[PDB]
Design a protein around this ligand. Structure first.
Ligand SMILES: Cn1nc(C(C)(C)C)cc1NC(=O)Nc1ccc(Sc2ccncc2)cc1
Length: 336
């Protein structure tokens, strides 16, 4: 019967209190977020710099407890060099009544792609970063998990341009079939995002903006060209079928004319990732084989997940307290 488990100290971090185990020292505020806060730390065991996320009131609502539970499960399931993973998870609580929040420990990443964007990267850097992106996407897709919100702010990089995929209205990087829901989407939605990111790296300029869904669609069709019947039939929205069939049928493309600084292989890969047809758009596994990644491709590194991510409670409707017992029990039996 304690106030917190022995080995935990209290310390204010960016105007708020934190309870950490002994082994983590030198907490330094990194950022505030929608559902928690993040600081940096030093594991006095190994000596590595880690990142710790305190969840802010995860048990305030069924939606929030389900959210935090899912994030812990995802971080626990993914074991890939280009996907952020779990090092430790702990709570200062001693029973279920003191259980108010928990902390996640992750490898520390210096920055992300949104903060260093616009510097018109060389073809080499685009090759390396995009190749890592597609490896992480192949892995998470192989686990049955789709990101749905990939963007430069969700691509962390360190000093060596080593990349990991993260997660936590501007919709510049979302696939058209998602913004318009004009056909049912598959995993290749993430692939569209990669294209939008890669093009930005080539140009230093965001590809599709738009102040509403229709304007962004017009900007997109400026690049993809108005699609032909072969595609228009696959749409399930009839009003969008009519709108597309009513547009001035403006043909594609010419991606080597859209990005004059783009190499033919880069322009080609960009052609195949920015494809309106969700059945013709490259998968991550297919995009890894493109000749644009020849100087870096190592198929042994293009791993899949052993097991699909199995959130059996993904649909369940439990009280906040039941979710609490689930998360708590998940914390204790976690093991490094
Ligand atoms: C929900 N979800 N889904 C995924 C995928 C990519 C496997 C699909 C990952 C997460 N959670 C998460 O990214 N949490 C998180 C992100 C950023 C920080 S801040 C930070 C992290 C590492 N180094 C420095 C700062 C903290 C936690």
């Amino acid at each position: 019967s304690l106030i917190r488990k022995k080995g935990f100290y209290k310390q204010d971090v960016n105007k708020t209190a934190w309870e950490l185990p002994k082994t983590y020292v030198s907490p330094t505020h990194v950022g505030s977020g929608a559902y928690g806060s993040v600081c940096s730390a030093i594991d006095k065991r190994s000596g590595e710099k880690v990142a710790i996320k305190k969840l802010s009131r995860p048990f305030q609502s069924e939606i929030f407890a389900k959210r935090a539970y899912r994030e812990l499960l995802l971080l626990k399931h993914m074991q890939h060099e280009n996907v952020i993973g779990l090092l430790d998870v702990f709570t200062p609580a001693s029973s279920l009544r003191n259980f108010y929040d928990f902390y996640l420990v992750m490898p520390f990443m210096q920055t992300d792609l949104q903060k260093i964007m616009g510097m018109e990267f060389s073809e080499e850097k685009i090759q390396y970063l995009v190749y890592q992106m597609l490896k992480g996407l192949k892995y998470i897709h192989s686990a049955g998990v789709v990101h749905r919100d990939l963007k430069p702010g969700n691509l962390a990089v360190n000093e060596d341009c080593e990349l990991k995929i993260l997660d936590f209205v501007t919709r510049w990087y979302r696939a058209p079939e998602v913004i318009l829901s004009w056909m049912h989407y598959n995993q290749t939605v993430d692939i569209w995002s990669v294209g939008c990111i890669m093009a930005e790296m080539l140009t230093g300029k965001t590809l599709f903006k738009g102040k509403d869904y229709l304007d962004q669609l017009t900007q997109i069709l400026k690049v993809t060209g108005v699609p032909g019947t072969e595609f228009v039939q696959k749409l399930n929205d009839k009003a969008a079928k009519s709108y597309i069939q009513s547009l001035p049928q403006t043909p594609r493309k010419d991606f080597t004319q859209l990005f004059p600084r783009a190499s033919p292989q880069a322009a080609d890969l960009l052609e195949k990732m920015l494809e309106l047809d969700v059945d013709k758009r490259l998968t991550a596994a297919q995009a890894l084989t493109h000749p644009f990644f020849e100087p870096f491709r190592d198929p042994e590194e293009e791993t899949e997940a052993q097991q699909p991510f199995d959130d059996s409670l993904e649909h369940e409707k439990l009280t906040v307290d039941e979710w609490k017992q689930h998360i708590y029990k998940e914390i204790v039996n976690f093991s490094p």
